Amino acid sequence: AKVPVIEWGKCEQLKPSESERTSKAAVVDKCLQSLPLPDATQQEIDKHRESVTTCALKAEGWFDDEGVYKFDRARNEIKNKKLDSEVEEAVLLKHDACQKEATEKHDDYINQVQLYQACMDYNISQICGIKVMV
Ligand SMILES: [Ca+2]
Ligand SMILES: [Ca+2]
Ligand code: NA
């Protein structure tokens, strides 16, 4: 269980804050109590990962009363990071583009956030030059 080295490229401002790191450690710790990790197939690991992720989003208030992911919360959290204005523009464009694809391809609110997050993970890493080394 090696600690990753992250190169944040042009997006160092996206680094999580101390409150976010402390929260995420405790929220995921609690989710794993009731959704323990297997230690088998890729399919089983992924399902367990996705279940822990939904549990973590709900614990942090990421679904509104209708159960829809809070896309507008995500958008505002990007702006609150205070990226360089040109980089902020590019990151907000990908938020809007990924949201539109997710909500067109899926009616299911969980499938929507999985597609949105997959789309943001790929596109934000490319624009920012983010590299994770384990
Ligand atoms: Ca760097
Ligand atoms: Ca379309
Ligand atoms: Na569903």
Residue numbers in the entry: 11 to 49, 53 to 147
What does the literature reporting this entry say, word for word?
In this work, we have explored the structure and function of such non-insect OBPs in the mite Varroa destructor, a major pest of honey bee. Mass spectrometric analysis demonstrated that the six cysteines VdesOBPs, whose sequence position do not match the pattern in insect OBPs, are paired into three disulphide bridges (C1–C6, C2–C3 and C4–C5) different from that (C1–C3, C2–C5, C4–C6) of their insect counterparts. The overall folding, determined for VdesOBP1, is also novel and different from the conserved structure of insect OBPs, although some similar aspects can be recognised. Comparison with classical OBPs reveals that the second of the six α-helices found in them is lacking in VdesOBP1.
Data were collected at 1.968 Å resolution on a P3221 crystal form and a second dataset was collected at 1.81 Å resolution with wavelength λ = 0.98011 Å. They contain one and two molecules in the asymmetric unit, respectively. The chain was built in the electron density map of the P21 crystal form with the exception of residues 1–6 at the N-terminus, while the P3221 crystal form starts at residue 11 and lacks loop 50–53. We checked the integrity of the protein in the crystal and our analysis showed that the protein was intact, confirming that the N-terminal segment is present but not ordered in the crystal. The r.m.s.d. value between the structures of the two VdesOBP1 crystal forms is 1.55 Å. A crystallographic dimer can be reconstituted in the P3221 form, using a symmetrical molecule in the crystal packing. However, the second monomer of one form does not display the same orientation relative to that of the second form when the first monomers are superimposed. All in all, it seems highly probable that the biologically relevant form is a monomer.
